[PDB]
Amino acid sequence: SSFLDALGYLGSLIKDFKRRRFFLNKAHQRIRNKLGVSFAERRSQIVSKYDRKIASARKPAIIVKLRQRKEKALKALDKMRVREEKKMIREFATQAA
CA 36 → CA 5, 26, 39, 94, 95, distances in Å? Predict the structure, then answer.
């Protein structure tokens, strides 16, 4: 009987399990939302910055170099996005482990 009425301790402990998991999930989830919004705004900023010059360039070398610089910036930010997302998945998996 000492064990049996000590067996109830499962309920609180499993509640702590599922609850703390909910805690970790929402923490990672807001991390993901924040970083995704970060990437989207970085894109919008860079594309607007380059399109302001693209709108009135009308010179082949200038417009082509502006497009090259914009594409390079987008490629760098894109590498950032992909490495971030893969490492975020790996991070959340490490958390769960």
Answer: 49, 15, 5, 20, 20
